[PDB]
Design a protein that fits this description.
The structure is cut from a larger assembly and holds chains A (152 residues), B (52 residues) and C (48 residues).
Chain A lengths: L4 E6 L2 E9 L2 E5 L5 E2 L2 H4 L11 E4 L19 E4 L4 E5 L2 E5 L11 E2 L8 E7 L4 E9 L4 E4 L5 E2 L1
Antiparallel strand pairs in A: 1-2, 1-4, 2-3, 3-5, 6-7, 7-8, 8-11, 9-10, 10-11, 10-13, 11-12
Chain B lengths: L1 H29 L8 H6 L8
Chain C lengths: L14 H33 L1
The chains are: A mainly beta (152), B mainly alpha (52), C mainly alpha (48).
PDB class: virus like particle
Keywords: Semliki Forest Virus, Receptor, virus like particle
Entry title: Structure of Semliki Forest virus VLP in complex with VLDLR LA2
C-alpha cells in the first residue's frame, strides 16, 4: 500500500497527499500544491468547496495500483498510517498528536484492507482527537466535521 | 387603533403558535444522541443545523 | 395644427405592450421557476 498514496508537493515539500481509490484519484481540496507524479498531475480535477474533496478519474493504465473501497462502517477498529483509529458513534477518534497538520490526505483503511475514509482535519480534544473526515455512504460522499476541527 | 391592535394580536398569536409547533416537533430530535432530523422535517421546518 | 396632446405611450392591453407583457410574463415565470428549483435543491443539500 506504499504505491497507492501519492504525496502533493508545494515549493519542494510535501504539504499533503492524494490518494488513489476506486477508479478515482482524490485529494483534500483545501491543501494546495501539485501531484508529485507528473503523469497524474496533468489531469483535470473537479473541486467542490462544500466537500473539500478534489477528484478526477485515474488513467486507465494505472488502475491496478488503486485500493479497494467500502461503505459499510461497523463499530470497531480501523487502520491508519499513524497507528490505529477507532470508529464509534458516527465519529472517528485517534490518539491526540498522532495527527500532525500537513498529512491531511492520507486514507483510513479497514480491517480487510479497503479505504473507508479520507482524513481532512482534526478536532483536538482530550486524549482522543476526533478526525474530521469525508466518507462515502452507499451513494453520497459526506463530510463529518466535529466542532472546531482545524484544516490540516 | 383597535383593528390594528387586533390584527397584531392575531399575527403574534399565530406566529407564536407556529414557533411552538416548531418546538413541539423538533425538540424530540434534539434530546436524542443521534441527530437524525430527517430532511423532510429538515426542510419543512427550519432545522437547528445539528453539529455532528 | 395637431388637435391632440402629444402623448404616445400605449396603455396596457394594447397589442404592443400586451406582447411585451406576455414575453416578460413567460420569461419571468421561467426565471422564478429557476429560482424555485435552485431553492429546493439547495435546501435539500443544506439538510442532506
Amino acid at each position: 500500500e506504499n504505491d497507492c498514496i501519492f504525496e502533493v508537493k508545494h515549493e519542494g515539500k510535501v504539504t499533503g497527499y492524494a490518494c488513489l481509490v476506486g477508479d478515482k484519484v482524490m485529494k483534500p481540496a483545501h491543501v494546495k500544491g501539485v501531484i508529485d507524479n507528473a503523469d497524474l498531475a496533468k489531469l483535470a480535477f473537479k473541486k467542490s468547496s462544500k466537500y473539500d474533496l478534489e477528484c478526477a478519474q485515474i488513467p486507465v493504465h494505472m488502475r491496478s495500483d488503486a485500493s479497494k473501497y467500502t461503505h459499510e462502517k461497523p463499530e470497531g477498529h480501523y487502520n491508519w498510517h499513524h497507528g490505529a483509529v477507532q470508529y464509534s458513534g458516527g465519529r472517528f477518534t485517534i490518539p491526540t498528536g498522532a495527527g500532525k497538520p500537513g498529512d491531511s490526505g492520507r486514507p483510513i483503511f479497514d480491517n480487510k484492507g479497503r479505504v473507508v475514509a479520507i482524513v481532512l482535519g482534526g478536532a483536538n480534544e482530550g486524549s482522543r482527537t476526533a478526525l474530521s473526515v469525508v466518507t462515502w455512504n452507499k451513494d453520497m460522499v459526506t463530510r463529518v466535521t466535529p466542532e472546531g476541527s482545524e484544516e490540516w | 387603533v383597535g383593528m390594528s391592535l387586533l390584527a397584531l394580536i392575531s399575527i403574534f398569536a399565530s406566529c407564536y403558535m407556529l414557533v411552538a409547533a416548531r418546538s413541539k416537533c423538533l425538540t424530540p430530535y434534539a434530546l436524542t444522541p443521534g441527530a437524525a432530523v430527517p430532511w423532510t422535517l429538515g426542510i419543512l421546518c427550519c432545522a437547528p443545523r445539528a453539529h455532528a | 395644427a395637431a388637435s391632440h396632446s402629444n402623448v404616445v405611450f400605449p396603455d396596457m392591453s394594447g397589442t404592443a405592450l400586451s406582447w411585451v407583457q406576455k414575453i416578460s410574463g413567460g420569461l419571468g415565470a421561467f426565471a422564478i421557476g429557476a429560482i424555485l428549483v435552485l431553492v429546493v435543491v439547495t435546501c435539500i443539500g443544506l439538510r442532506r
